[PDB]
Amino acid sequence: EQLANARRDYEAEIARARQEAAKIVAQAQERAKQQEAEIIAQARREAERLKEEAR
Amino acid sequence: EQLANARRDYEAEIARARQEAAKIVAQAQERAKQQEAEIIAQARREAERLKEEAR
Numbered sequence: 001e002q003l004a005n006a007r008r009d010y011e012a013e014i015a016r017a018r019q020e021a022a023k024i025v026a027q028a029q030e031r032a033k034q035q036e037a038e039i040i041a042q043a044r045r046e047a048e049r050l051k052e053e054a055r
Numbered sequence: 056e057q058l059a060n061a062r063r064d065y066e067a068e069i070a071r072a073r074q075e076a077a078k079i080v081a082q083a084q085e086r087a088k089q090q091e092a093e094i095i096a097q098a099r100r101e102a103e104r105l106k107e108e109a110r
Binding site for chain 1: 057059060061063064066068071072075076078079082083086087090093094095097098099100101102105
């Protein structure tokens with residue numbers, strides 16, 4: 001059983017590597033969107049405060 | 056075979072995360088720097104113009 005299913009285990013390992021190859025990109029893209037939104041919002045609030053202070 | 060199968064998935068999942076997160080860096084830095092420069096621009100638009108009009 002183990003020797004016969006070792007081929008299936010190797011195929012499943014390759015499939016898991018392939019699945020992780022895209023999940024790594026997707027999670028990083030989600031974090032990118034979150035961080036960019038946070039930075040943009042903070043700097044826009046800073047810009048509004050700077051406009052008032054400059055007035 | 057089990058050790059090699061685990062190692063393949065681990066190696067596939069280890070490297071790509073930092074490279075994918077680097078895709079964050081360009082957009083997030085562009086947004087943050089552009090918004091800080093917009094804060095500076097809002098500060099500077101009033102500073103010279105209001106002084107000129109107040110003269």
